[PDB]
Amino acid sequence: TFRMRIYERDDFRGQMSEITADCPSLQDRFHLTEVHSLNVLEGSWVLYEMPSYRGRQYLLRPGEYRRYLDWGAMNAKVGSLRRVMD
Amino acid sequence: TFRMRIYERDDFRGQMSEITADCPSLQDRFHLTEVHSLNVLEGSWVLYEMPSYRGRQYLLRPGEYRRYLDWGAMNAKVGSLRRVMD
């Protein structure tokens, strides 16, 4: 019950990648260096600007985010994703 | 099952305030503009730089943060606190 989908393009367009675990490095695993849209289907996650959980943080609660501005980021870059459990 | 203690001073010194609910403004609730140390007993919370959950965000999971540097901030400014639920 931690499931989200990230897209190559804005508004849920482009290839999709479903993430169900923490990811210390989006570039190494998914070869993504920018997430343009995302849909948080289950659970809250924290999106990090840099790899290994570093840099500006942005909380992600269940819902749709069709553009990086929606999660309050200044750019579409993201280095790691983490699930909020404890 | 959410709970934390907030101190205006470093290393858990001095006056302590306990919270179990969200708080849009720490200035209003406790006449606080800066928090210098905290102990997150239960739950995961997001601490915001400014009131009404706005500004830089910093995730706090159960644990002891004896000084602001410990939750990644570059200053002790904190405006609101929210429990990570949904």
Side-chain angles (χ1 to χ4, degrees), chain A residues 36-49:
Chain A
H36 280 77
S37 71
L38 80 234
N39 188 162
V40 181
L41 299 167
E42 286 136 39
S44 306
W45 300 66
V46 170
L47 181 151
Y48 295 80
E49 182 186 36

Side-chain angles (χ1 to χ4, degrees), chain B residues 14-44:
Chain B
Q15 191 160 5
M16 178 226 305
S17 293
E18 197 167 279
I19 77 166
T20 54
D22 303 293
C23 182
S25 147
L26 271 67
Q27 234 248 83
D28 266 58
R29 194 100 134 74
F30 311 105
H31 194 241
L32 272 182
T33 43
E34 286 187 322
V35 175
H36 276 68
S37 68
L38 52 98
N39 188 171
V40 194
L41 299 165
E42 306 171 53
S44 281

Side-chain angles (χ1 to χ4, degrees), chain A residues 4-85:
Chain A
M4 85 172 257
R5 306 183 153 159
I6 67 185
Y7 303 74
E8 171 208 10
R9 243 95 73 38
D10 296 339
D11 302 286
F12 308 148
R13 295 176 127 101
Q15 181 179 347
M16 187 272 280
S17 301
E18 199 175 291
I19 298 86
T20 44
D22 300 339
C23 173
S25 174
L26 203 58
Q27 219 271 110
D28 295 327
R29 194 154 105 212
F30 299 94
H31 301 173
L32 280 168
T33 227
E34 278 176 51
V35 171
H36 280 77
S37 71
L38 80 234
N39 188 162
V40 181
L41 299 167
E42 286 136 39
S44 306
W45 300 66
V46 170
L47 181 151
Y48 295 80
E49 182 186 36
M50 270 150 28
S52 301
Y53 318 111
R54 280 192 34 142
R56 295 257 311 197
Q57 313 183 22
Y58 305 98
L59 176 69
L60 257 26
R61 290 184 290 135
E64 316 183 331
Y65 305 81
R66 312 162 176 257
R67 202 157 250 98
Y68 72 86
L69 286 168
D70 300 354
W71 58 81
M74 293 135 29
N75 50 42
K77 302 194 316 159
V78 25
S80 34
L81 295 162
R82 188 217 280 296
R83 298 174 299 177
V84 182
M85 9 183 226

